[PDB]
Amino acid sequence: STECSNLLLQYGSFCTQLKRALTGIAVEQDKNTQEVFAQVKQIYKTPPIK
């Protein structure tokens, strides 16, 4: 709705900082997964004897 967008443009930068907070959370989740699981530098594998 164009009228709602034109009245929403007078409320400032609430949408930008909510978007910034959600983007920070989304980057932080991948940072958490990388810092937990990617602790090894080489991909070792087990020899075929078991």
Partner: peptide, 24 residues
């Protein structure tokens, strides 16, 4: 939004850690 690391890559990291722990 989808995650950056798929489940296959997390499984590969887990397998590498397990193989290193067992063999070294």
């Amino acid at each position: 939004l989808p995650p950056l690391l798929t489940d296959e890559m997390i499984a590969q990291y887990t397998s590498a850690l397990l193989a290193g722990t067992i063999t070294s």
